[PDB]
Design a binder for this molecule. Structure first.
Ligand SMILES: Nc1ncnc2c1ncn2[C@@H]1O[C@H](COP(=O)(O)OP(=O)(O)OP(=O)(O)O)[C@@H](O)[C@H]1O
Ligand SMILES: [Mg+2]
Lengths: 170, 78, 987
C-alpha cells in the first residue's frame, strides 16, 4: 500500500510525538543537533505516581537504521541507569528491540517502543536480567533497591532542560 | 471447493495446506506465517511463472488440487 | 593424501563439506567434446578439485567454435580442440592434472573413469553405446547439449547410487521442554522445530530417558509447528528436564535407467514449470535433430530454413508414433516450437552454455560424492523470450547468415543487426568477484561493448585473495595481491581481443564517497547496469542510483547451491529495494552477554571481546594522546564513559615491556573472564536458584556455567594465551623471537594468580597519565583479517569462544566453523556462479530489445542441490496519486531547475501540484518544517537549497555535484498528509 521511506516515516512520527496536541507527555523528544532524523535524544519520564521511577528525567539516545521500520532501532540510556534490565553501557534487554515475548515488527513505532520501555522500568523482567546489582537487590534487598532507584531519580533531575515544565502526576 | 496444495521452500522443505479456491493470497501468507514464522512481507511465492500478489485469490492463478507453490528468496553472495 | 587445502577451497568447503571433497579427490572425470559446453563443464569441475580431468576432442578448431569456447583463440584454428585447451584447463587448479585422450576407438578405455560426460559433439548413437558401457560397468554417465536458445541434460548414475545428503542444509536443532510417554516432543516455549514428516532426529541432554541420547534415530511425525512425535518412549524411562534434538540426514539408495530406456520413457525434471508441456516436445525434437543429422551426412538443419524445419516436424511426428509414452494420447506436436528448434539448431549462445555448464558440472560433483540430490533423469530448457521483436530485428536466412566471425553462431539465432547493437552497448558492472568474472567472460563471448559506440566499465576496490581462485577463474596464483578489475579486464581481452581498449577497469568502491567519479554524466551515459555484489548495502545503493537515473539494472546473487536473478526496468517494474528479504539472525543482548546456549553466542561474544581488547582500546589511547579535548568529548558524548576511561587507564597502566609480560596479561585475562566473572555470576544466581514460580532459574535456554581451571594442555586454554599475548604484543609494538607449551607453562607456573572475591568518575580522569609523559607513544590497532592464518585473529576468536563454551557446557568448534560464523563468510562455488550468470545474460537480451511487455521478463530462483529452477514475471511498479494526479511510486519524481529558494520551492508546489510542503529533508538532515518557530522559519525560507544545506549540515555542496535529491512530506488540497515522489534539484 503506502511504502513510505525511512526518513519520511521518522519525520511523521517525530512530528506527532512533538505536536502540542498529540505529543505523549511521558517523552521529551528532540533530534540530534535539531537536524539528524535517524538519531533522537529522548528524555524518558515516569508519570505513574505509584511507580518507583516517578519524578525522574532519564536522558537516552535512539538510533534508527536506514531500513526503518523493517529493522529495529537501537536504544541506550545516557548515562546508564540503575535497573535490572540495563547494562553498565546504557544498553538494555528488551524483547521489542530484538528481531526474529513480542519481538520487533514493521508495525511497531517509536511510541510503542518507548511505551514498552516505561513499562519495563516499572516492572523489570527478572527472568532475563541484564546485570546485577539491580537484579539481585530487586529480590534480596528491596530497601537497598528503592534507595538506589530514588538516588537515581534525583540524579536524573539535573538533566532537565532549562524552562521545561515537568508534566503533572497521573 | 476445498483442495490440497503444497508449498515448497528453496531449501527443499514441503508444507501442506488445506485451502479453498476462493482463499486470498493474503490469507495464504497468514497461514504460512503461523506455520513457518516467516512474516508475509518476506514471503516470495511463485507458481507457473507468476509471483503471487495480495488481493488476488488462488483460483486467479489457476491453482488446483495437488498444486505446489514455491517459497523463494534472494541471496546476497556472488 | 586425504588432506584438503583449506586456504584454497575455503568457500567451497562450506558448500560441499570435507567428506564430499574427499570423494571428489578420488574421482577421475572424462569429458567428451570441448566446444563451449564441454569447456564450461571442465572449467567448473577442475576448479572444484577432482582427482583428474581427461578431455577428448580431436576435432580441429574452427572460428565459429569461439562463440562460447572462451579458451580458444584464432591462432588455434586448425589444431585439435582438446590439445589447445588442455594446458589452459590445467592452469585453473594445480591440484588437478588435465590429460588428453587421443582416441576413443576402444570403448574399454572408459573403465578408468568414475564419471563420463558426453557433450554436444557426441552423436546420439555414440551416446547410447557409451552409456550402455558405463551403465553396465557402474560408471556414472551424464550427457548434455545446447542448440540455440534450447538445451538439455541427461543423468544416469547407474543401478545403484546412494545420496548421503539430499539438500546440504544446516541440520535443524532445537531445545525440548517435554517428551511425553507417547513420544510427543514439545518445543521450548515459542520455538519452532522446523521439521517435516519423515525427517529423523537424534537427542542429547534429555534427562530421564537415558538411552534416548545414545545417537539412535527417531522418525518425526509432525503434529504442529511447535510439536512432533517420535513414538513411545516408555521403554527409555520418564522425562525429567532438558534435551536438544538434532536432525540427521539418512542415506537414500536410488536407481537410474539407461539412456536407451529413457529415450522411450523419460523421467522429466522441469526447468520452468510454466513450460512443462514443452519438455516432452523438446525431448522428441532433440532426438529428431540427431535423426536429421543421420539423413544429412551429420549436418544440422540449416539456419532459419523452412524446408529443414518442416522435415524436422515430420521426424518428430514419426518419433511420437515410435515413442507414444512421450507426448501421450491426444497430444499433438507443437510445430511452432519444433520449428524454432530447427531454426536455431546451429546456434551457440553464451547464456545457455553457462546455464548447462554450471548445472552439469554440479551434477558431476554429485556423482562423485553422493552430496545433493541428483537430477533424475532428463531436463529440458529454452529461453525463447530472449528473442527480439522480429519487426525491429527480422530473422531470416539472410540476416542470420555467417559473416566469418567468432559471433557467427550467435548471429545464427539473433541476426547481424541485433549482435551489432550488443557490441554498441554501454554497460556498468559493479563488482569483479565470482559473478563479475563470469559476467565479463560472457560479455567477452558476446562481444558486448566491442563496437565503436559501446564500452564496458567494471569497478571493484578489492584485491585478489587465494580463496578467490576457487571460483574466480580469470585469476591465477601469481595474481594474488593485484586488483581484481584490472586483472579480469586483461584476461577477457586475451580471450576476445575485440575488447582491447574497450574495457575501463576501475578500482573504486561504489557508494556515497565516490559520487564525483560516478557522477551524473557517468550514469546517464550508460545503457544499463549489472550488479555482481556480495552485500545488501551496495545493492541498495546501486538500485537507488538506477532509479534516480532510470537505468535498467540486472541483479543477481548466490549462496552455495542457491541463486537468484532479478530484472529492474525503468517505468515498468519495482526496484530491488521495493521488497524485503529475511534479515540476518541476531542475538538478544542478555543471551549474548550472560546466558549463551549455542556456539554462535560464544563466537559473537569472543569477536566483541577481540575488538575491545585489540582494536577499540588502541584507538581510544591514540585519540587520548593526540586530541586535546578528548577527555571533554567523551564526558559529553557520552554513552559508556566509565568503560572508555578504564580502557585507557588499563592500557597505560600495565604496559608490557616484553612478550613474557603479554603472556602474563593473557593468563590473567583468562582468569578474569572464565573464572572470576563466572563465579561472580554464580554468586548472584546460584546453580540451585529459583525463579518466581519456584522453577529453577538455570533451566531451558539458561545453562548453569562452571568456572574454568586453567589447563595448558587444553587446546583452547593454551591458544587463548598464545593468541591473546601475540595480539597484545602487536598493539604495543613488541616483536617476536609455533608456540611451545613448556615455555608458556614455565611463565604461567611462576605467576601468583589472585583468588576470587565477590563484590566517583572524577578520580579516573585524574588517574590518567599526562599525554606529555607519553610523547610519541602509539598503539597499533588490529584490523580483523579472517583469511590470514598467521595473524592469530581466528586463533584468538576460536579459543576465546571455546573457553566460554566450556564455561556453559557448549560443545566447542574448530577454527573453520568459527571463521565461517565470525567472518560472516558466504558459502560459494563456481557451478552456481556460472549458472546464475548465464540466466542474467539471457535476460540481458531483453534489455537490448527494449522490451516493454513485463511478461517477457523473468526473475530467476535456483537451487542446484535439489535441483530446482523456478521463474516469475517481475512485479509491476506500484502507482499512487495525490490530488487525483497519478504517479509511479518508484520511478516518478519532481524536477526543479536551479538553486531555488525554499520559499519559491514551497510556493511552486502549492500552485503547480496543490501540495503544501510541511517537511523537507536532504539525506539524513531535516532542512525545513512548517512547525518551526517564526525565528527559524524566516531564516530558512529565504535561503537557496545549497545554503539551506550548509546552514544545517555545516558542509558546503561540492562543485562536482550537479543534482540534489530532496524528500518531502506534504498535505494535499484537503489538508491531509499524502505520499509524494522525491524532488530532483538540477543545479
Ligand atoms: N560497494 C562496492 N563497490 C564495488 N565493488 C564491491 C562493492 N561491494 C562489494 N564489491 C565487490 O564485489 C565482489 C563480490 O564477489 P565475491 O564475494 O565472490 O569476492 P570476495 O568478497 O573477494 O570473496 P569472499 O566473499 O569469498 O571473501 C568483491 O570482489 C567485492 O570487492
Ligand atoms: Mg565477498
Amino acid at each position: 500500500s503506502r511504502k513510505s521511506t525511512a526518513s519520511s516515516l521518522l519525520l511523521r512520527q517525530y512530528r506527532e510525538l512533538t505536536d502540542p496536541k498529540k505529543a505523549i507527555p511521558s517523552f521529551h523528544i528532540e533530534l540530534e543537533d535539531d537536524s539528524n532524523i535517524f538519531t533522537w535524544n529522548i528524555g524518558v519520564m515516569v508519570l505513574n505516581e505509584d511507580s518507583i521511577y516517578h519524578g525522574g528525567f532519564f536522558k537516552a539516545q535512539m538510533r534508527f537504521p536506514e531500513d526503518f521500520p523493517f529493522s529495529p532501532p537501537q536504544f541506550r540510556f545516557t548515562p546508564a541507569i540503575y535497573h535490572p534490565n540495563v547494562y553498565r553501557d546504557g544498553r538494555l534487554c528488551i524483547s521489542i528491540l530484538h528481531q526474529s515475548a513480542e519481538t520487533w515488527s514493521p508495525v511497531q513505532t517509536v511510541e510503542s517502543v518507548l511505551i514498552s520501555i516505561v513499562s519495563l522500568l516499572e516492572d523489570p523482567n527478572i527472568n532475563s536480567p541484564a546485570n546485577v546489582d539491580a537484579a539481585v537487590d530487586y529480590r534480596k534487598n528491596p530497601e537497598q533497591y528503592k534507595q538506589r532507584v530514588k538516588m537515581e531519580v534525583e540524579r536524573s533531575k539535573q538533566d532537565i532542560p532549562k524552562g521545561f515544565i515537568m508534566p503533572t502526576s497521573e | 471447493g476445498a483442495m490440497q496444495i503444497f508449498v515448497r521452500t528453496l531449501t527443499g522443505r514441503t508444507i501442506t495446506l488445506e485451502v479453498e479456491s476462493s482463499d486470498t493470497i493474503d490469507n495464504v501468507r497468514a497461514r504460512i506465517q503461523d506455520r513457518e514464522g516467516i512474516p508475509p512481507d518476506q514471503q516470495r511465492l511463485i507458481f507457473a511463472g507468476r509471483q503471487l500478489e495480495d488481493g488476488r485469490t488462488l483460483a486467479d492463478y489457476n491453482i488446483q488440487r495437488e498444486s505446489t507453490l514455491h517459497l523463494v528468496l534472494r541471496l546476497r553472495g556472488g | 593424501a586425504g588432506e584438503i587445502d583449506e586456504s584454497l577451497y575455503s568457500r567451497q568447503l562450506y558448500v560441499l563439506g570435507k567428506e564430499a571433497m574427499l570423494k571428489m579427490q578420488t574421482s577421475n572425470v572424462l569429458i567428451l567434446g570441448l566446444k563451449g559446453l564441454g569447456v564450461e563443464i571442465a572449467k567448473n569441475v577442475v576448479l572444484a578439485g577432482v582427482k583428474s580431468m581427461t578431455v577428448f576432442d580431436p576435432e580441429p578448431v574452427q572460428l565459429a567454435d569461439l562463440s562460447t569456447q572462451f579458451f580458444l583463440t584464432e591462432k588455434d584454428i586448425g589444431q585439435k580442440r582438446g590439445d589447445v585447451t588442455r594446458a589452459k584447463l590445467a592452469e585453473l587448479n594445480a591440484y588437478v592434472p588435465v590429460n588428453v585422450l587421443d582416441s576413443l576407438d576402444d570403448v574399454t578405455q572408459l573403465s578408468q573413469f568414475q564419471v563420463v560426460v558426453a557433450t554436444d559433439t557426441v552423436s546420439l548413437e555414440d551416446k547410447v553405446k557409451i552409456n550402455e558401457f558405463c551403465h553396465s560397468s557402474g560408471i556414472r554417465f551424464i550427457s548434455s547439449e545446447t542448440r540455440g536458445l534450447f538445451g538439455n541434460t541427461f543423468v544416469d548414475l547407474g543401478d545403484e547410487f546412494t545420496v548421503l545428503d539430499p539438500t546440504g542444509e544446516e541440520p535443524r536443532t532445537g531445545m525440548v521442554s517435554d517428551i511425553e510417554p507417547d513420544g510427543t516432543v514439545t518445543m521450548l516455549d515459542d520455538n519452532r522445530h522446523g521439521l517435516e514428516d519423515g525427517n529423523f532426529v537424534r537427542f542429547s541432554e534429555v534427562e530421564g530417558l537415558d538411552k534416548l541420547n545414545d545417537g539412535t534415530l527417531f522418525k518425526v511425525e509432525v503434529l504442529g509447528p511447535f510439536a512432533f512425535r517420535i513414538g513411545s518412549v516408555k521403554e527409555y524411562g520418564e522425562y525429567k528436564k532438558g534435551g536438544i534434538f538434532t536432525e540427521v540426514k539418512v542415506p537414500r539408495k536410488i536407481s537410474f535407467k539407461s539412456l536407451k530406456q529413457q529415450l522411450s520413457n523419460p523421467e522429466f525434471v522441469f526447468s520452468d514449470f510454466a513450460k512443462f508441456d514443452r519438455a516432452a516436445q523438446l525431448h522428441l525434437g532433440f532426438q529428431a535433430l540427431h535423426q536429421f543429422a543421420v539423413r544429412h551426412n551429420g549436418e544440422l538443419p540449416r539456419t532459419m530454413n523452412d524446408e529443414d524445419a518442416n522435415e524436422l516436424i515430420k521426424l518428430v511426428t514419426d518419433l511420437s508414433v515410435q515413442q507414444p509414452e512421450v507426448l501421450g494420447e491426444g497430444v499433438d506436436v507443437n510445430e511452432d516450437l519444433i520449428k524454432e528448434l530447427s531454426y536455431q539448431a546451429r546456434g551457440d549462445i553464451p547464456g545457455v552454455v553457462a546455464f548447462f555448464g554450471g548445472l552439469v558440472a554440479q551434477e558431476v560433483l554429485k556423482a562423485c560424492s553422493g552430496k545433493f540430490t541428483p537430477l533424475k533423469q532428463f531436463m529440458y530448457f529454452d529461453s525463447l523470450e530472449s528473442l527480439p521483436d522480429p519487426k525491429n530485428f527480422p530473422r531470416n536466412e539472410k540476416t542470420t547468415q555467417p559473416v566469418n566471425s567468432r559471433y557467427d553462431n550467435q548471429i545464427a539465432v539473433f541476426g547481424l543487426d541485433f549482435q551489432k547493437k550488443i557490441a554498441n552497448s554501454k554497460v556498468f558492472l559493479v563488482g569483479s568477484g565470482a559473478i563479475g568474472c563470469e559476467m565479463l567472460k560472457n560479455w567477452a563471448l558476446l562481444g558486448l561493448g566491442s563496437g565503436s559506440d559501446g564500452y564496458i566499465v567494471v569497478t571493484d576496490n578489492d584485491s585478489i585473495e587465494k580463496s578467490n581462485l576457487n571460483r574466480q577463474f580469470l585469476f591465477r596464483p601469481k595474481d594474488v595481491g593485484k586488483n581484481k578489475s584490472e586483472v579480469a579486464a586483461e584476461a577477457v581481452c586475451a580471450m576476445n581481443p575485440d575488447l582491447k581498449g574497450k574495457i575501463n577497469a576501475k578500482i573504486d568502491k561504489v557508494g556515497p564517497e565516490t559520487e564525483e567519479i560516478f557522477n551524473d554524466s557517468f550514469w546517464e551515459s550508460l545503457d544499463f547496469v549489472t550488479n555482481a555484489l556480495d552485500n545488501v548495502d551496495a545493492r541498495t545503493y546501486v538500485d537507488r542510483r538506477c532509479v534516480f537515473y532510470r537505468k535498467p539494472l540486472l541483479e543477481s546473487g548466490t549462496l552455495g547451491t542457491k541463486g537468484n536473478t532479478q530484472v529492474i526496468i525503468p517505468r515498468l517494474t519495482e526496484s530491488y529495494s521495493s521488497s524485503r528479504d529475511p534479515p540476518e539472525k541476531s542475538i538478544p543482548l542478555c543471551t549474548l552477554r550472560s546466558f549463551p546456549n549455542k556456539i554462535d553466542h560464544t563466537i559473537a561474544w569472543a569477536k566483541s571481546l577481540f575488538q575491545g581488547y585489540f582494536t577499540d582500546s588502541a584507538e581510544n589511547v591514540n585519540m587520548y594522546l593526540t586530541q586535546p579535548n578528548f577527555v571533554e568529548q567523551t564526558l559529553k558524548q557520552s554513552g559508556d564513559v566509565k568503560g572508555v576511561l578504564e580502557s585507557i587507564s588499563d592500557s597505560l597502566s600495565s604496559k608490557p615491556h616484553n612478550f613474557e609480560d603479554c603472556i602474563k596479561w593473557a593468563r590473567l585475562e583468562f582468569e578474569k573472564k572464565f573464572n572470576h566473572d563466572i563465579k561472580q555470576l554464580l554468586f548472584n544466581f546460584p546453580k540451585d536458584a529459583k525463579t518466581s514460580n519456584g522453577e529453577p532459574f538455570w533451566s531451558g535456554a539458561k545453562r548453569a556455567p562452571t568456572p574454568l581451571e586453567f589447563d595448558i594442555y587444553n587446546n583452547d586454554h593454551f591458544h587463548f594465551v598464545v593468541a591473546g599475548a601475540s595480539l597484545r604484543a602487536y598493539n604495543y609494538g613488541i616483536k617476536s623471537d609455533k608456540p611451545n607449551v613448556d615455555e608458556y607453562k614455565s611463565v604461567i607456573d611462576h605467576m601468583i594468580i589472585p583468588e576470587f572475591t565477590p563484590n566517583e568518575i572524577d578520580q579516573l580522569v585524574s588517574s590518567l597519565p599526562d599525554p606529555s609523559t607519553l610523547a610519541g607513544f602509539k598503539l597499533e590497532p588490529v584490523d580483523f583479517e579472517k583469511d590470514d592464518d598467521t595473524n592469530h585473529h581466528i586463533e584468538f576468536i576460536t579459543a576465546c569462544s571455546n573457553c566460554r563454551a566450556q564455561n556453559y557446557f557448549i560443545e566447542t568448534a574448530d577454527r573453520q566453523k568459527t571463521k565461517f560464523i565470525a567472518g560472516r563468510i558466504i558459502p560459494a562455488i563456481a557451478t552456481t556462479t556460472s549458472l546464475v550468470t548465464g540466466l542474467v545474460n539471457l535476460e540481458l537480451y531483453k534489455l537490448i530489445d527494449n522490451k516493454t511487455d513485463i511478461e517477457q521478463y523473468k526473475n530467476g530462483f535456483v537451487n542446484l542441490a535439489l535441483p530446482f529452477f523456478g521463474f516469475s514475471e517481475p512485479i509491476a511498479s506500484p502507482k499512487g496519486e495525490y490530488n487525483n494526479k497519478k504517479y509511479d511510486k518508484i520511478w516518478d519524481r519532481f524536477d526543479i531547475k536551479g538553486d531555488i529558494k525554499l520559499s519559491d520551492l514551497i510556493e511552486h508546489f502549492e500552485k503547480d501540484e496543490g501540495l503544501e510542503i510541511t517537511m523537507l529533508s536532504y539525506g539524513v538532515s531535516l532542512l525545513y518544517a512548517s512547525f518551526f518557530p517564526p525565528k527559524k522559519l524566516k531564516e530558512r525560507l529565504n535561503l537557496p537549497i545549497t545554503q539551506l544545506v550548509k546552514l544545517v549540515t555545516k558542509k558546503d555542496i561540492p562543485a562536482h555535484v550537479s543534482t540534489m535529491i530532496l524528500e518531502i512530506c506534504a498535505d494535499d488540497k484537503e489538508g491531509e498528509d499524502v505520499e509524494v515522489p522525491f524532488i530532483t534539484i538540477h543545479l
